[PDB]
Amino acid sequence: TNPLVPSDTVQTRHVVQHRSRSESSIESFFARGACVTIMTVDNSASTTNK
């Protein structure tokens, strides 16, 4: 993949960059509890068929 940056094809000015990739790191991408299942139980009287 061609590693080009804007100053390669257009006239650029100077910019002091503040943005960071902090939130798109692998940890940060997955750092959320996600629902994987719902389990159903109950508490009724065990009777000959059920």
Partner: peptide, 11 residues
């Protein structure tokens, strides 16, 4: 100012 600049093209 460069520190506050945002669009990268020559103004």
């Amino acid at each position: 100012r460069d520190s506050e600049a945002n669009p990268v093209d020559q103004p």
